[PDB]
């Protein structure tokens, strides 16, 4: 039951960390309508994190969403490197959202047919939200890439900046393989076709170039992160670390 | 003239003035200012609350805080819609907000220095807004009143969550209790000032239905018991029940402070407008992009 | 002995918080020579913080520099609002440094004649360092204000941005007054002439304008801060909060 | 030829080559590259260490960390000075560093994920650099050798502090001990790669390099293993053992393929390190221009 715990935790960690990033945007968006959308997506993602983290705690037989979020350190977090990247400008944020949304849609479509009932049920809620996310993020990819000269250039720089982290989306380890062989999990390697089909298309439709660099960065899943995660956790966990074991 | 008579009649018989209807220009203008400032308030208020999203103590509370901030953006949008039915443009009054030519609720010029501040804003500050908004539900201008009804149904829910977050602190560790008391100490008087100073045309026109003092009185009458439920004190030595009137009498509001705050010389005035300005300026390339893409 | 503790703590807190800010600049300066200088100034200031904080702990009869730095929360910190301002660009950082250095020089010059031996001794060390700081910061004020069109404009925006926080430099409360009446402390109000003499001159010599806005922001000394301090303490205190009471 | 002959004789008798002396172009370009990459390393190395300044656990340790970073910037400056005595310009080779045309020590492409990493960098990574630098103290180019002596006196002091910080963790709580072990596990091999793979023909003959990479690595391991044991920690190498027959600790096979990815910009932090220096340089332009304009008045 250990591998199942780790697998559920990872999905929760992706959603949790991305949620944190989107939270920093609150009141700082280019339009009110965007502020609203970013808050909404962040809220959806937080909801999925709570569902995945709660299930992970249940599986482990101890803790809850809060002990998992607030008492683990960076070497124990298992989110994808992509979701811990800084917000940068709006293009940076849209690029990251897009890559994650495409992946989420591909993953949850398949994961709702999981032989694990609770994972299937969570994925069934998640997919509905992920589709709205992909519409938003693909929408802006189009608007920015196929906008002005300035905006299209920023959108391309954003895609180039994040590109190397996309390899982790299709990296499979012992946990993924064992569980996909049991029909419980999706083998990430098999997500590449659907992902590339959507993303390659979207990038092309936005008059941009798919980068030629072969993506090479992994590690998040095994607790090996960029120097970004640590400072995020310091901010997120502060209050729980100052006053542990309390009710709020 | 005769229009300014059927109008006076519609106000008396409590019939809703709609956008297409005739109305005096002065009434049109004071409504643009009020609905406009109300809309600005929803937008600026996102900042002090948003300051704690990434730091909120539990995923439950974090989720509640995001939901509330999302709603504020939504309510900002309803109120801008409602303002535009009077002929003004939203980017125009928005710019006046950025210039200082239009104002927003004074309460959002105070900093959130602890997690309790969020609970207290949710409970006290929103408590004050709800009183003010329920009171504006029978305002004479139809699109404004209908908006007030829609907003009140949703906002009171969030205000209850605010109070529950405060109850968690009040029933918690000693440090949590002190955190709460401190937040109350810093937010009590600024909350009382939200209602405004101690109107001729507005009351006659039924834009405003109650005086500032009346509304403040009822806020205090309803809030003091809640403060007691939490085992907390109010930072007012002169707060006492008066069995003659049947109201709580309370100390003088420091109006010098209120005047500094609304004139841009409060604690966070500069930081709030700087944040909105920077958001607007740095967002220009994004808005232009959306425009250009639509034209294709 | 309580007022003396609070007075020493404030001076410590000013130096500590400014030190943190300067630490963020490490490896990110426009020139190597500037990186070195900023690291050096940060180091000096950290030294003064350690001296002031150590003395504060001695006076209180409990704790040390580390319990004072890492276990107080934002409402217990008593630094000037000026030192917690974000780094912004290099002009923002120089403006802040300049205002603080002018103040430090004026303060420590007088505070080395304090009737409290330990405060006198600390100030005697501090002043030597402060003079170097003022030279650096005044130097760059001149170079930036009297540089290009672009740089002078950035330097003026920087001065305007910080100006309102200068009022706290000359704000005096019960603690300042009582101790100045005992010849132990300097009454901050009496620092204005020396400070304005230096700063008004420097600004003029840099071809810039002293802002016309009357400075109005105070609170830091009583634990009432901008929204900047909190996130700083979260980063600074993380490790001590995660693993309290430990040796490092 | 006689210029070449007077030179090769100087090298063999270890008469120190000076800036004004005649020298083969290859020799000059090799030294520019080595001193230049050594300077780049001092500069880039500020980043992984500086990442922890604002988070350091005590004011004592924070002060020590700031001191060390200040020293690295200073040593960067000496080495750029020393590079320029050979005819290159510092902003020129700096730009080559930003382009990827010039490299820096591979160790700085690894992330600092805990406080222990700082201690371990201070101890291990600087232990490795001190072995390398003491070895360069008798390099044939005078300005470089003199720089090496100056740097070594100061740098070894900081390396001792690095070890003391690790000792604090090794003697502390169980969590502190685990933090240390994890840092060691992540930095041990990258530290061994610092010395380079198993050029050298000309460099050794010219006495630019005095020892082989393998020789220096061996001497690092022989001197480090005992310090690992002093801390009650383990080295993540199953094949590590002492060899009485020769008198050295032998170690496992280093993966030189990893090393190749790292120096070719495909390590963990390569992008982030160059992005940080570039951004610092680009966004600093208006500042450097301002200083230029102000001088001209």
């Amino acid at each position: 039951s250990n591998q199942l715990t780790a697998y559920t935790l990872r999905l929760g960690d992706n959603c949790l960390v991305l949620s944190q990033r989107l939270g920093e945007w609150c009141g700082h968006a280019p339009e009110l309508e965007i502020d609203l959308a970013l808050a909404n997506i962040g809220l959806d993602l937080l909801g999925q994190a709570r569902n995945f983290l709660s299930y992970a705690a249940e599986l482990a037989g101890e803790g809850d969403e809060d002990t998992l979020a607030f008492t683990r350190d960076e070497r124990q977090f298992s989110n994808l490197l992509l979701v811990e990247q800084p917000n940068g400008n709006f293009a940076d944020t849209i690029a990251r959202q897009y890559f994650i949304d495409a992946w989420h849609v591909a993953l949850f479509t398949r994961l709702m047919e999981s032989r694990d009932p609770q994972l299937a049920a969570i994925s069934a809620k998640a997919i509905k939200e992920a589709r709205y996310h992909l519409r938003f993020s693909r929408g802006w990819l189009e608007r920015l890439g196929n906008g002005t000269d300035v905006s299209g250039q920023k959108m391309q720089q954003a895609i180039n900046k994040l590109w190397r982290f996309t390899a982790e989306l299709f990296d499979a380890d012992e946990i993924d393989i064992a569980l996909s062989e049991e029909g419980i999990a999706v083998d990430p390697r098999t997500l590449r076709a659907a992902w590339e089909a959507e993303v390659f298309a979207g990038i092309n439709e936005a008059t941009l170039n798919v980068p030629q660099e072969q993506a090479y960065r992994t590690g998040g899943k095994k607790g090996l992160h960029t120097e970004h995660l640590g400072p995020m956790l310091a901010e997120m966990q502060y209050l729980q670390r100052v006053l542990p074991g309390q009710q709020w | 003239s005769t229009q300014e008579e059927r109008f006076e009649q519609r106000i008396a018989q409590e019939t809703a003035i709609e956008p297409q209807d005739w109305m005096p220009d002065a009434y049109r203008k004071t409504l643009i200012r009020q609905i406009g400032q109300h809309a600005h308030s929803e937008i600026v208020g996102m900042l002090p609350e948003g300051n704690w999203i990434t730091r909120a103590p539990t995923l439950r509370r974090k989720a509640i805080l995001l939901a509330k901030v999302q709603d504020e953006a939504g309510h900002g949008l309803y109120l801008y819609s409602a303002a535009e039915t009077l002929g003004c443009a939203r980017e125009d009054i928005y710019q006046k907000m950025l210039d200082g030519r239009m104002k927003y609720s004074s309460i959002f010029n105070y900093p959130t220095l602890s997690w309790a501040d969020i609970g207290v804003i949710g409970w006290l500050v929103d408590g004050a807004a709800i009183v003010n908004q329920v009171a504006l539900c029978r305002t004479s201008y139809g699109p404004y009143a209908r908006a007030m009804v829609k907003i009140c149904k949703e906002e009171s829910f969030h205000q209850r969550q605010g109070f529950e977050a405060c109850m968690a602190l009040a029933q918690g560790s000693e440090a949590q209790k002190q955190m709460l008391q401190d937040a109350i100490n810093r937010f009590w008087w600024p909350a009382l000032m939200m209602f405004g100073p101690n109107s001729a045309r507005s009351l006659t026109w039924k834009i405003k239905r109650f005086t500032n003092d009346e509304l403040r009185q009822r806020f205090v009458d309803n809030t003091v018991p809640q403060v007691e439920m939490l085992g907390m004190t109010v930072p007012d030595p002169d707060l006492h029940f008066d069995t003659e009137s049947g109201h709580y009498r309370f100390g003088e509001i420091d109006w010098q402070e209120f005047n500094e705050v609304i004139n841009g010389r409060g604690i966070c005035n500069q930081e709030r407008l700087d944040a909105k300005r920077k958001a607007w300026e740095e967002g220009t390339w994004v808005r232009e992009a959306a425009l250009a893409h639509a034209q294709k």
Side-chain angles (χ1 to χ4, degrees), chain A residues 1-112 114-117 119-212 215-248, chain B residues 1-3 6-8 10-24 26-28 30-48 50-200 202-207 209-296:
Chain A
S1 187
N2 289 337
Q3 293 177 335
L4 180 57
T5 316
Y7 185 84
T8 325
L9 201 37
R10 282 169 184 173
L11 301 174
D13 280 355
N14 298 332
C15 301
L16 176 57
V17 175
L18 186 55
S19 197
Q20 280 294 109
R21 283 304 191 210
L22 293 171
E24 293 157 44
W25 269 104
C26 177
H28 310 277
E31 313 171 344
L32 177 63
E33 299 81 343
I34 298 173
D35 252 306
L36 177 75
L38 297 178
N40 190 25
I41 291 168
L43 184 58
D44 291 346
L45 289 174
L46 187 49
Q48 305 164 18
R50 291 180 75 202
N51 297 156
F52 285 118
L53 264 39
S54 289
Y55 187 37
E58 206 173 327
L59 293 162
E62 52 168 25
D64 49 27
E65 69 188 39
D66 294 329
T67 72
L68 282 164
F70 296 103
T71 69
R72 285 183 298 148
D73 75 10
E74 59 175 289
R75 293 281 291 107
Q76 297 169 298
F77 264 71
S78 65
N79 59 286
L80 301 156
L81 299 174
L82 204 41
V83 303
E84 72 192 48
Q85 298 307 304
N87 283 337
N89 66 45
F90 188 64
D92 299 308
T93 283
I94 287 300
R96 177 185 70 198
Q97 201 59 47
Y98 181 55
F99 296 169
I100 284 300
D101 297 342
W103 192 77
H104 271 158
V105 169
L107 169 73
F108 295 141
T109 297
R110 289 220 253 151
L111 202 56
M112 66 185 285
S114 166
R115 283 186 60 260
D116 182 63
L119 257 166
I122 292 157
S123 294
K125 283 181 278 211
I127 188 68
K128 296 178 168 170
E129 291 164 352
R131 285 185 179 119
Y132 278 86
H133 300 164
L134 185 54
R135 268 186 297 275
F136 175 85
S137 46
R138 203 197 144 109
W140 280 104
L141 176 72
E142 295 302 320
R143 285 198 274 269
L144 301 180
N146 201 343
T148 65
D149 277 21
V150 150
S151 80
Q153 187 199 295
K154 273 173 171 159
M155 195 63 256
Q156 184 67 61
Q157 284 174 59
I159 285 155
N160 297 355
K161 208 193 186 196
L162 285 164
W163 191 256
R164 70 187 177 285
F165 294 108
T166 58
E168 193 170 30
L169 297 170
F170 319 114
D171 194 71
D173 61 0
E174 46 267 58
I175 291 153
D176 295 310
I177 294 161
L179 297 166
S180 87
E181 279 170 0
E182 294 171 39
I184 297 166
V186 175
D187 178 338
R189 285 171 303 187
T190 70
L191 289 164
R192 176 188 297 282
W195 186 86
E196 287 184 0
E198 155 69 60
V199 169
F200 288 14
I203 290 172
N204 158 71
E205 192 183 303
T207 79
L208 304 163
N209 306 313
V210 174
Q212 185 64 60
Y216 65 95
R217 292 285 291 104
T218 57
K221 285 160 77 200
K222 261 160 57 73
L224 300 166
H225 296 275
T226 74
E227 294 171 340
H228 284 113
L229 193 57
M232 283 183 73
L233 293 187
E235 207 180 35
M236 190 182 79
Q237 300 184 342
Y238 185 55
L239 190 50
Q240 280 276 357
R241 304 292 195 158
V242 171
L243 301 172
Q246 294 300 320
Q247 295 297 317
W248 303 90
Chain B
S1 90
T2 259
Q3 305 257 56
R6 175 164 83 240
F7 174 84
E8 333 262 312
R10 285 170 170 169
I11 301 305
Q13 63 197 16
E14 295 302 320
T15 308
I17 316 301
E18 298 303 322
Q20 335 83 27
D21 289 351
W22 189 92
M23 72 199 62
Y27 170 95
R28 184 172 295 270
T30 71
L31 271 173
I32 289 163
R33 178 167 79 68
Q34 171 150 349
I35 305 174
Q37 295 188 153
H38 205 142
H40 300 332
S41 293
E42 299 290 344
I43 284 186
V44 171
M46 286 177 75
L47 292 172
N51 180 229
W52 275 86
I53 285 156
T54 55
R55 275 179 292 170
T58 70
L59 305 185
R60 181 177 181 170
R61 289 299 171 211
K62 195 183 231 88
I64 287 158
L65 188 50
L66 270 163
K68 180 169 198 307
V69 141
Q70 161 172 53
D71 269 33
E72 282 163 24
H75 299 159
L77 291 170
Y78 294 139
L79 293 172
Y80 284 123
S81 278
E84 286 176 335
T85 72
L86 293 155
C88 69
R90 71 171 65 199
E91 36 286 298
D92 187 306
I93 51 167
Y94 195 71
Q95 197 74 43
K96 280 158 179 186
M97 186 251 265
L98 304 171
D99 280 339
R101 274 184 289 166
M102 280 177 81
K103 283 144 163 152
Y104 50 87
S105 188
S106 59
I107 195 64
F108 301 128
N109 297 300
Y110 293 82
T112 55
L113 305 179
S114 81
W115 166 253
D117 296 18
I118 303 299
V120 164
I121 277 150
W123 160 53
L124 279 204
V125 171
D126 291 28
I130 278 152
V131 166
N132 201 257
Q133 289 162 178
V134 169
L136 291 172
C137 287
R138 300 226 292 262
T139 192
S140 57
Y141 189 57
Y144 193 29
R146 285 186 296 276
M148 287 299 91
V149 173
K150 272 179 291 149
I151 283 158
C152 279
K153 282 189 173 71
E154 306 177 37
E155 271 206 28
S156 63
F157 175 81
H158 289 302
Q159 192 270 352
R160 186 43 82 67
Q161 317 276 105
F163 184 75
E164 284 168 355
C166 291
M167 188 52 78
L169 299 177
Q171 291 183 321
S173 83
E174 195 61 34
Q176 283 174 313
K177 289 180 196 143
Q178 281 173 30
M179 203 187 299
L180 185 54
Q181 187 61 67
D182 181 55
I184 294 167
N185 289 347
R186 279 178 294 108
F187 276 95
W188 177 259
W189 292 104
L192 298 192
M193 299 184 205
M194 285 176 71
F195 294 96
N198 298 299
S199 288
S202 297
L203 282 162
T204 309
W205 284 334
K206 295 185 185 166
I207 293 161
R209 307 300 312 269
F210 298 92
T211 66
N212 297 349
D213 288 342
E214 277 171 20
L215 286 176
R216 175 148 51 239
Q217 193 56 74
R218 152 73 41 218
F219 174 73
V220 176
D221 290 340
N222 281 6
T223 306
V224 171
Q226 298 165 40
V227 182
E228 298 173 348
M229 289 189 58
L230 294 162
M232 301 284 135
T233 66
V234 165
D236 184 12
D238 317 301
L239 173 78
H240 64 281
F241 194 71
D242 178 22
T243 306
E244 200 169 309
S245 68
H247 300 314
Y248 285 107
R249 299 289 163 199
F250 50 90
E252 295 302 320
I253 289 145
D254 172 13
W255 295 110
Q256 186 173 355
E257 188 196 336
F258 181 76
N259 204 249
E260 298 298 297
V261 173
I262 64 166
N263 285 325
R265 288 188 300 284
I267 297 164
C268 305
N269 295 74
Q270 199 55 55
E271 288 85 353
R272 298 285 183 246
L273 293 193
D274 283 352
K276 297 323 278 200
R277 274 197 288 270
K278 185 196 196 289
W280 181 258
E281 282 161 5
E282 290 189 343
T284 309
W285 72 269
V286 174
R287 294 187 304 278
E288 288 169 351
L291 177 63
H293 179 89
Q295 288 166 350
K296 302 171 192 168

